[PDB]
Design an enzyme around this catalytic site. Structure first.
Site, PDB file in Angstrom:
ATOM      1  CE  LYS A   1      -4.022  -7.060  -2.190  1.00 19.17           C
ATOM      2  NZ  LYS A   1      -4.764  -5.821  -2.007  1.00 19.17           N
TER       3      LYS A   1
ATOM      4  CG  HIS B   1      -6.552  -4.766   6.812  1.00 22.25           C
ATOM      5  ND1 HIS B   1      -6.792  -5.450   5.650  1.00 22.25           N
ATOM      6  CD2 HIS B   1      -7.739  -4.275   7.343  1.00 22.25           C
ATOM      7  CE1 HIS B   1      -8.109  -5.340   5.503  1.00 22.25           C
ATOM      8  NE2 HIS B   1      -8.713  -4.623   6.480  1.00 22.25           N
ATOM      9  CG  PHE B   2      -5.737   0.320   2.553  1.00 22.63           C
ATOM     10  CD1 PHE B   2      -6.943   0.366   1.889  1.00 22.63           C
ATOM     11  CD2 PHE B   2      -5.018   1.480   2.738  1.00 22.63           C
ATOM     12  CE1 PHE B   2      -7.454   1.578   1.422  1.00 22.63           C
ATOM     13  CE2 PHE B   2      -5.491   2.714   2.333  1.00 22.63           C
ATOM     14  CZ  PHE B   2      -6.741   2.757   1.650  1.00 22.63           C
ATOM     15  CG  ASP B   3     -11.236  -1.964   6.828  1.00 26.09           C
ATOM     16  OD1 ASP B   3     -11.114  -3.223   6.666  1.00 26.09           O
ATOM     17  OD2 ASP B   3     -12.361  -1.527   7.245  1.00 26.09           O
TER      18      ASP B   3
ATOM     19  CG  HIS C   1      -1.895  -1.277   1.156  1.00 28.21           C
ATOM     20  ND1 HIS C   1      -2.921  -1.381   0.196  1.00 28.21           N
ATOM     21  CD2 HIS C   1      -1.853  -2.408   1.937  1.00 28.21           C
ATOM     22  CE1 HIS C   1      -3.457  -2.560   0.419  1.00 28.21           C
ATOM     23  NE2 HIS C   1      -2.860  -3.197   1.479  1.00 28.21           N
TER      24      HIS C   1
END
EC number: 4.6.1.18
Length: 124
Positions: free
Chosen positions: A41, A119-121, A12
């Site tokens: 992905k 984590h990238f939500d 990210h």
């Protein structure tokens, strides 16, 4: 094994650019960051800010993550991001993406000490 914090940085962060410069940004970055090595992905977000500014979100506004965990945080400020999503023609190993630029608040989950994004939500 690569730590959760390191994976987040690899998936990210893009502190090297202020935004996507061409429609091929996603194609190039998804491949260079190894996000298409084993499968394509499907979606991914890149954040065009310093690492410390993104790490900093871990002490900004708490908010439940999409999956309900309570270790997510929303950035006080909007940030320059790039949104990558496969095109209808994407087919492993030839993963292909649509690049979209945006200036949105980011929502990440954090963990550890130092408490950092893992984590990238979402972008909101």
């Amino acid at each position: 094994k690569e730590t959760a914090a390191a994976k987040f940085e690899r998936q990210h962060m893009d502190s090297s650019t202020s935004a996507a410069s061409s429609s091929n940004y996603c194609n190039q970055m998804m491949k260079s960051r190894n996000l298409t090595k084993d499968r394509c992905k499907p979606v991914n977000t890149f954040v065009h800010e310093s690492l410390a500014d993104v790490q900093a979100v871990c002490s900004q506004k708490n908010v439940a993550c999409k999956n309900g965990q309570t270790n997510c945080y929303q950035s006080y400020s909007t940030m320059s991001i790039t949104d990558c999503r496969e095109t209808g023609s994407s087919k492993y190993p030839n993963c292909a993406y649509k690049t979209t630029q945006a200036n949105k608040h980011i929502i990440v989950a954090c963990e550890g000490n130092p408490y950092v994004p893992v984590h990238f939500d979402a972008s909101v």
